[PDB]
Subunit: 143 residues, 3 copies
């Protein structure tokens, strides 16, 4: 219905696809990558996209990314704004390895979806809010 235009780094990239039981779409390593334990690598995903106007993309690991590849995503969740749409605006997955690992070209290491950007807001400075505190950081306990 809405269109995402996708440009691949080259012909050798494995084209991404929606699967029926996957609500997000898996993204793939653009090359083989070796990462040592406790080291970092920006893993190319080999895709550039023009998202629909007013949308952004979010990128997170798969549940199995750690078991299969030994990495976490250092930025937690990546945000790809609609403006990141140029011919050379390729996506990357920021990986920290918790064990020595090999990722192979084409491996499905993360997943993405789109959703609307937040509404327009205006931040208005006040000197006092006049509300009771909720508390946070575990105020409700654990049991």
């Amino acid at each position: 219905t809405m269109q995402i235009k996708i440009k691949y780094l080259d012909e050798t990239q494995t084209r991404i696809s929606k699967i029926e039981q996957g609500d997000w779409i898996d993204l793939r390593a653009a090359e083989d990558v070796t990462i040592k334990k406790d080291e970092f690598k920006l893993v190319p995903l080999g895709v550039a996209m023009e998202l629909p106007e007013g949308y952004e993309a979010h990128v997170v690991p798969r549940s199995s990314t750690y078991k299969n590849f030994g990495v976490i995503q250092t930025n937690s969740m990546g945000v790809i704004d609609e403006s990141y749409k140029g011919d050379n605006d390729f996506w990357f997955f920021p990986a920290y390895a918790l064990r020595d690992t090999e990722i192979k070209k084409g491996d499905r290491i993360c997943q993405f979806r789109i959703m609307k950007k937040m509404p327009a807001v205006e931040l208005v400075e006040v000197e006092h809010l006049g509300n009771e505190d909720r508390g946070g950081l575990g105020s409700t306990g654990t049991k």
Copy 2:
């Protein structure tokens, strides 16, 4: 009002609840779990659910999970696909421990909400962007 249908692993699971000042709902460890420093374990949450038609769920840690339990969630924000609604599709929290830790049965360790899924989209391959 939308319904979430929840099936518990067994009668010993602590039934989950909404609290007024919690915009996401807390989920609980299904059993005692020990995790050693620099090890991974899938913490069972003791729940299987059928979400409203067209919805997914998202799962993240509580802010106090790291102090209390010394774990991070390896997938950052877990996505529960709408199709994960079978009788054996029990939810889990994928934990990596940064120190030796013990989690007790019933402990509130993460939180979830529901969200409309991304609609069907067309992926149109192009040679160049604009």
Copy 3:
């Protein structure tokens, strides 16, 4: 535009305000913070807010946070509950350092957006779901 009321901790906090059309908004460390390798610290952000009615906020690292500071966010994506709007409900970024690091007062370290909260839902216990199993945790493989 929807209004967000923002209160700063003190006059020394670096103000955000600017024109806001949908992009995530950067937040800043409220004081200098030193973190040792493999240790944790709250990083105070020096802001308290009242979000629009019916909205929560989400906080993630900036894309450059790991490169600049060597930290990951321990809760991945922070959820600021709508009720966290008191005069002493100051936001924080929960940081774990993978190297020795220094964060300076005023340094941009994380980013946020608002989002409509999940509506009221009824939790209905059932004995049996009656659907086929999907499976999970990497059931679709990696290739």
